[PDB]
């Protein structure tokens, strides 16, 4: 049904295309692909990339950044300004109004995030293109992690860059660190190209060849995620004992609309809220027998997390990682444990 | 679809199932829930299980075997059977009451691989379950390795032993070589650990790693072989340069009905007659531009092989190993080839 | 001093040559040359080569084999020889003499493995290969796994084949296992292919490359193991708590000067006997702090163990694998126990 | 030998300690160690390193560098002070009293490569050290890239940073890339912690894993590369076709004498300039079988080098970065090559 048409070619180009040196430049020609991208540059972590994106700024110069609020980022973005001497400005995107105001004469480079972890707040990409083309000459950046090149395409959408960072968790939970940074731009892909090797925060060949490797598989991997939170968010917003569900994949999202002509699927990322107190979500995730317990996202299995202890985030509040098990056995587990939680 | 249902809890087992020592023995545990079985026992190639399991047998012993026509087996089996002097016989089980008449007071041993290759014949495990259970003590061996333990489970049709062999050739060009044998019966399981440890033909602890950690996508990645393979063969059998398509997903394939209650969905063999001459089938080939030509079958890579020249088989019959890209891409790069073959 | 001339080239070999398919191929062309044979087969196993030679008798011939006494093996072999229908014969062949002795018409193997395990009585190969090949047509085969082909050439001691039996211990805990066979004959070589071939109990692509990766390094690796064996069996021989020691590289050696006509140098494998009682071997063992206490022998850690507890051996009696750490540090750790034994 | 003596526990520290989270900590303590330090921080690359460095310095301060001449280093660091906005100075430390005139209020950082590359001038750590020290707040770094942990331990002498930066080249052609920074002082370590966390210039958990694994035959490799080196430097010195040679191990090194109170021995660097002209050269280095073409170094593999085509330096002048091969061969190699370039 309703969301953009999935890319075309991407699984054959994960497969095919380019099948630093040798090993980096197949990663980044196959990147560059899937990204939509005409180049890519890769970076030892999503961090490096960020900080080597920053360096195209020169000191002075003022950058915008989502405001990751409950999330953890913001720390990072702070310090890389401190040094470097550069001007941080967190604003919420979430309202492209006031993204139109913040812009100061100053702003060089807008840093966006969507959707938000863990709330999930969907921001509009395009229009957010739109208001920072405007007037100018400042970037905007896309950071892909939360979506994946598969379901997302900020390139396409107006981006300047889109920026994919993998941690050591989703091909398996394969060691695999990485910071891909993607752009269609001439001069963005020289200058960044002359940071990559001019300060060394590269990958190694190694990396290079299994995080190429994985790639082969990210569309039917993704595709699983996909299936099972869909299913998962469903069962859970027509479950008593759940107060409120936060999916993209859902109409009920205040963002579904924006969701279906942005992306072309959804993560296994899907927060909800159980019926009750912090003593509920307690028992709930001390009960599920499925489901792992994990601060982190990605894996080939289901995990669960109380971001209130792993003006607060309510600690009714609860985000799970979809992985790849079965459908069914993902769902008895969530109803089992959401049984006890309420006798 | 009026496949068997999906086995349950496949997925989940791939993936969280156990997660000659350690690594061998999590394997074992994981395989044998894939495969619906009490036990299984993995030796270093498909090969060396199959020599194990026939040294079940002794002296005098007979063994009945699909008769591979075309295909390369046949000489295997021989070399094993005059060696270790054992009584061999080949029948074309596809007939029932073919094997019937073959059954003999020294049978012990029915071994049958279904779908056959590369014509595809289906065998109906369950009836060669109840013709050789019947009379006598004997062995009915199913080689699941043209199906996996995802679309096909021989243990629950009625087959003693489940033998699943992987070349160096799925979960990617993985080159990781294994041969698992699952199994029920108590008696069975104690004589082939016997034979497994007291002989030595076993994987290293790093194949026994590797093979447990592609079955953990194996599911995904054949669901995309099924779907993909069943595009393609729809495809070829509406183009007008086809004679006629053999692929056990489709409602034309002469045992349809016998892979629907066997089967619970099909691998990305399609095999296929090309309209015309031994020429037209090589102009096919040439040009072909997304397929990969090769005689190997089951990595990513879409793959497609002319047997005459890789009585005898048909010089226009063309076997495909699809794989996981694009559908559309694949559906053009055929088309464009068939075209090119017929000016 | 005193052994034989290393073997020429072995580093430059082990490095270049060819620097199953392609992976095995160059393994084995490689180990062929290590071996000063012709020829070379890898098999899955050390037990996996063992079977596949005995497959070359037929049913009736008569194998005798060194007694392993103290050590493992004897259970295999008789089991081996018990199915396939042969006639096993386990002979003390330390004393030459008594192999002339057991030679029967049927004898068509003899089966020795030097160093012996773990009391390493060193057996004359070179008197072994002329009363064996004296008379008839019989095959001699050393188990070079205890020298390995860096400090002991069994074909050029008139050996028939060299068997390397490598277990998941040596290249560091690197879980390789593999089972080599060089040769020089031309139809032994010829059956011995056919057999490789036909039974499957074959290494997997990834094994043959890590086991050729680590061969690059045996030399400088097993020439340390050597200065530090010889090390640690001196300090102990000269110990006021060790009643005798057993090292090939010593002069006190009842087989010395055998050792220095056959090999090239010795392994960093020391037994010894503790002045005391098995309640001393206990203190001592529970006092090292650098020496680990396995069962296992190889790797690049020093490994003690107490085999009466791990006519019986002497429960006085201790075997080391010395490994690669600092020679200082390594006859500290085993004077500080020594002391602690005996307060 | 009148070295150093061989450091102390290294060995066993590099096969036993420790066997951004795990893997990176435990690869830190063993480095750590195998450095003698208190501290060590992984990065990416070595470059990362070097870039993390200069870091600890801010806008206006200056650093000297060893002005490293026919290499091909000093564009960075350039390139890096660029950026940044650091002044940078390129002096020639091998001249002790060079460096004290260069010392300025703004000098916080001197950074020293040693033994040059590919001349090999030998910089004596420790005078720097008390020259650097003697006035103000400045940091000592040394880049112990040539020569490694194992020869060399510029803490030990007086240098506040030690900089070990690993290339896709060593322990085989294992491509593991890596820039280990060692230190003591409490505070250096503190900002250095800080900016390895904060900036993400960090390697790969598998990366670390591959590393430290490579770190436990250090000094096997390194041994039979200085074994190697030094008979290759005293052949090509007393053969005829040589006009002279330069190795740290040779008395005839300008700084022989330095060497043996700095270092514990010598890498498998050796420098020599055939006589004649560069088409002797030339044909030297096209007669060559055993040694093979190529600018890298590091290998299991004996490689050679004409600088002159890969004021400037002697087309005379040729490097060598003798492997791990049989002395033997190499010498026979290079005195075939020699001869041929001199009918």
């Given at each position: 049904?309703?969301?953009?048409?999935?890319?075309?070619?991407?699984?054959?180009?994960?497969?095919?295309?380019?099948?630093?040196?040798?090993?980096?430049?197949?990663?980044?020609?196959?990147?560059?692909?899937?990204?939509?991208?005409?180049?890519?540059?890769?970076?030892?972590?999503?961090?490096?990339?960020?900080?080597?994106?920053?360096?195209?700024?020169?000191?002075?110069?003022?950058?915008?950044?989502?405001?990751?609020?409950?999330?953890?980022?913001?720390?990072?973005?702070?310090?890389?300004?401190?040094?470097?001497?550069?001007?941080?400005?967190?604003?919420?995107?979430?309202?492209?109004?006031?993204?139109?105001?913040?812009?100061?004469?100053?702003?060089?480079?807008?840093?966006?995030?969507?959707?938000?972890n863990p709330?999930?707040?969907?921001?509009?990409?395009?229009?957010?293109?739109?208001?920072?083309?405007?007037?100018?000459?400042?970037?905007?950046?896309?950071?892909?992690?939360?979506?994946?090149?598969?379901?997302?395409?900020?390139?396409?959408?107006?981006?300047?860059?889109?920026?994919?960072?993998?941690?050591?968790?989703?091909?398996?939970?394969?060691?695999?660190?990485?910071?891909?940074?993607?752009?269609?731009?001439?001069?963005?892909?020289?200058?960044?190209?002359?940071?990559?090797?001019?300060?060394?925060?590269?990958?190694?060949?190694?990396?290079?060849?299994?995080?190429?490797?994985?790639?082969?598989?990210?569309?039917?991997?993704?595709?699983?995620?996909?299936?099972?939170?869909?299913?998962?968010?469903?069962?859970?917003?027509?479950?008593?004992?759940?107060?409120?569900?936060?999916?993209?994949?859902?109409?009920?999202?205040?963002?579904?609309?924006?969701?279906?002509?942005?992306?072309?699927?959804?993560?296994?990322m899907?927060t909800?809220?159980?019926?009750?107190?912090?003593?509920?979500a307690?028992?709930?995730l001390?009960?599920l027998?499925?489901f792992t317990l994990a601060e982190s996202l990605?894996?080939?299995?289901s995990l669960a997390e109380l971001p209130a202890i792993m003006?607060?985030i309510?600690?009714?509040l609860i985000r799970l990682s979809?992985?790849?098990?079965?459908?069914?056995?993902?769902?008895?587990?969530?109803?089992?444990?959401?049984?006890?939680?309420?006798?």
């Amino acid at each position: 049904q309703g969301f953009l048409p999935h890319f075309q070619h991407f699984a054959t180009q994960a497969i095919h295309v380019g099948q630093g040196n040798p090993t980096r430049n197949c990663l980044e020609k196959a990147v560059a692909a899937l990204d939509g991208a005409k180049y890519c540059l890769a970076f030892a972590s999503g961090l490096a990339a960020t900080v080597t994106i920053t360096h195209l700024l020169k000191a002075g110069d003022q950058i915008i950044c989502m405001d990751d609020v409950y999330g953890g980022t913001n720390r990072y973005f702070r310090q890389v300004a401190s040094e470097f001497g550069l001007k941080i400005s967190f604003v919420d995107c979430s309202k492209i109004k006031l993204l139109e105001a913040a812009i100061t004469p100053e702003t060089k480079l807008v840093w966006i995030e969507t959707p938000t972890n863990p709330t999930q707040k969907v921001i509009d990409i395009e229009g957010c293109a739109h208001i920072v083309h405007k007037h100018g000459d400042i970037i905007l950046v896309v950071d892909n992690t939360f979506m994946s090149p598969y379901f997302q395409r900020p390139l396409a959408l107006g981006a300047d860059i889109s920026m994919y960072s993998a941690t050591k968790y989703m091909n398996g939970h394969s060691d695999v660190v990485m910071g891909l940074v993607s752009v269609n731009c001439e001069s963005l892909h020289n200058r960044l190209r002359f940071l990559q090797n001019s300060l060394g925060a590269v990958p190694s060949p190694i990396d290079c060849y299994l995080c190429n490797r994985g790639l082969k598989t990210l569309h039917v991997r993704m595709e699983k995620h996909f299936k099972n939170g869909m299913a998962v968010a469903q069962f859970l917003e027509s479950n008593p004992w759940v107060e409120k569900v936060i999916y993209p994949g859902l109409p009920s999202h205040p963002q579904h609309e924006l969701v279906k002509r942005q992306c072309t699927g959804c993560t296994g990322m899907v927060t909800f809220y159980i019926k009750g107190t912090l003593q509920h979500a307690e028992i709930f995730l001390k009960n599920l027998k499925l489901f792992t317990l994990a601060e982190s996202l990605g894996g080939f299995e289901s995990l669960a997390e109380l971001p209130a202890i792993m003006l607060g985030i309510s600690d009714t509040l609860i985000r799970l990682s979809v992985g790849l098990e079965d459908e069914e056995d993902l769902l008895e587990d969530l109803d089992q444990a959401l049984k006890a939680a309420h006798p």
